[PDB]
């Protein structure tokens with residue numbers, strides 16, 4: 555069901571969180587080789603998450619579930635903000651700009667934190 559597909563998507567999201575918090579430790583420790591690998595892993599987790607979220611939204615639309623569609627439109631919009639910040643973080647790492655990397659890191663944590671009450675609302679609406 556769309557609800558079990560949302561539980562898979564949620565698990566993928568939490569994996570990226572787990573990996574994101576590990577990457578943050580490695581960055582603070584200056585282990586740049588680890589950071590590079592974690593950033594590649596996060597790219598693959600987000601790209602997967604985003605595809606799943608689109609399939610949930612499209613299914614909610616086909617089912618006529620107007621409340622779930624509303625919430626998923628808002629949630630996917632916030633997802634694209636996090637993805638843009640993530641991409642900027644990756645660029646800062648390539649460029650050797652630790653000041654920007656720290657800044658983006660904190661921004662992505664706040665964007666992710668804000669979007670959590672909505673994430674729980676979607677689970678209940680599907």
Ligand SMILES: FC(F)(F)c1ccc(OC2CCNCC2)nc1
Pocket residue numbers: 567570571574575596636640662663664666667
């Ligand atoms: F890269 C993401 F996976 F999106 C990512 C980035 C940050 C993040 O932060 C967690 C950890 C504390 N801030 C809010 C939730 N959770 C996920």
